[PDB]
């Protein structure tokens, strides 16, 4: 029902766990989350994949539109937020606030 | 939660952060009279 | 291509030995003994003729697959149709930069030779110049004209389906472009 494609060239660049957010999906989706998480995170996969498409595109653009620069900085914030060390589980009550 | 985040943000602390004079060249103005 | 796939199905069910791309050994001979029956007969046999247009379908535009390679080696001329040119508006999608015919001028009427003679050269020069379209101000005028001719010839070669033109109308169509009246 879904893929958590772990990619070594994301793992090496600090993104741990190394989920390739383009290919990774869950097809049961937000039917398998508590209401708070569906409110807070209800599009986060699409927003990160759009950020990875934009980060690839804008890599060598000398200047960027105001909305583009906002999305590119928001994505770097979300990617830094999703990093997590080994054996540091978060209770769902802590995860909701972290994504909030 | 928003109120707690904004109370906390004021109290956070971020980690905020050989040429040779003989090879240098001179512009000149010429004068067709001998040096004093 | 579905001819060759049917003969592969039959041959494998009969436990004949498979070769490259699972085809039986004789698949070249299967296509050849079909195609080489197309010919023009001499006058002693009544001067009749048969012209073959074999179609084949190529996976992902490769031409190094077994059946393509055989039929390209058997046939006299090869009109490559490319889906990229199809999408870029060139319909029919004839890749005039790679399609060839070994018969050449001997199949054309004199009025077509008198016009089409430079056409392949003009389109080759246009395909070479194509990158300079972005910088056409800085290009020398003597080749800026070649670029503008080439772009008009590429428009002149488009054609709607089910509307074939008789020879006397297409010669006039190519005359417009080649003689520069269209510019």
């Amino acid at each position: 029902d879904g893929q958590c494609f772990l990619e070594s060239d994301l793992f090496n660049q600090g993104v741990r766990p190394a989920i390739n957010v383009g290919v990774s999906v869950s097809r049961v989706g937000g039917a398998a989350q508590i209401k708070a998480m569906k409110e807070v995170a209800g599009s986060l996969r699409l927003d990160l994949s759009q950020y990875r498409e934009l980060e690839a595109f804008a890599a060598f653009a000398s200047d960027l539109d105001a909305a583009s620069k906002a999305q590119l900085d928001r994505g770097a914030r979300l990617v830094e937020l999703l990093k997590q060390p080994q054996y540091s589980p978060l209770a769902v009550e802590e995860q909701v606030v972290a994504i909030f | 939660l928003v109120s707690v985040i904004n109370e906390f943000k004021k109290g956070f602390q971020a980690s905020d952060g050989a040429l040779d004079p003989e090879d240098l060249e001179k512009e000149s103005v010429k004068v067709r009279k001998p040096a004093p | 291509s579905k001819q060759a796939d049917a003969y592969r199905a039959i041959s494998l069910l009969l436990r004949r030995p498979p070769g490259r791309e699972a085809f039986p050994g004789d698949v070249f001979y299967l296509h050849s003994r079909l195609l080489e029956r197309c010919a023009k007969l001499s006058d002693e046999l009544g001067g009749g003729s048969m012209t073959g247009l074999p179609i084949i379908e190529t996976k992902a535009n490769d031409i190094s697959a077994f059946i393509p390679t055989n039929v390209i080696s058997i046939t006299d001329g090869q009109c490559f149709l490319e889906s990229d040119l199809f999408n870029q508006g060139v319909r029919p999608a004839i890749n005039v930069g790679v399609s060839v015919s070994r018969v050449g001028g001997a199949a054309q009427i004199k009025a077509m030779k008198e016009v089409a003679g430079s056409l392949r050269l003009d389109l080759s020069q246009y395909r070479e110049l194509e990158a300079f379209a972005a910088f056409a101000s800085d290009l020398d005028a003597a080749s800026k004209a070649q670029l503008d001719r080439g772009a008009r010839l590429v428009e002149l070669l488009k054609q709607p389906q089910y509307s074939p033109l008789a020879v006397e109308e297409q010669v006039v169509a190519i005359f417009l472009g080649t003689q520069g009246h269209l510019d």
């Binding site: 699409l46 890599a59 060598f60 | - | 990229d84």
Partner: protein, 114 residues
């Protein structure tokens, strides 16, 4: 164009031409950057990056994927929206405004949000 009418066929063929040209230019843009391209090509790229996202749609079965409800866009509205896009009548909207949006009424409201 004998079946669907010449309006539909023209709009479809213009959109495909634009997306094909954009797929040719991606390999350049990924190395040399969009700033290198001609003004006409750079304009086409800005139209294509919008067209791609306006081909996305919030489907009614994707309620559990996107949380937003689904929408149905009429054939005439589809033809008119893409016709306007290809001529650049929406080039001044921000690139994210088109994504998942559905029809022109929703497009306007989401552009006015941003």
């Amino acid at each position: 164009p004998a079946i669907v009418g010449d309006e539909h066929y023209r709009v479809a063929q213009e959109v495909i031409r634009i997306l094909q040209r954009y797929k040719d230019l991606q390999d350049i843009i990924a190395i040399l950057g969009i700033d290198e391209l001609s003004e006409e090509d750079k304009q086409l790229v800005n139209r294509a990056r919008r067209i791609e996202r306006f081909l996305s749609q919030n489907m009614m079965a994707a309620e559990q994927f996107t949380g937003q409800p689904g929408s149905t866009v009429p054939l005439k509205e589809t033809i008119e929206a893409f016709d306007k896009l290809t001529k650049g009548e929406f080039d001044h909207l921000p690139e994210q405004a088109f994504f998942l949006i559905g029809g022109l009424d929703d497009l306007a409201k989401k552009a006015e949000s941003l």
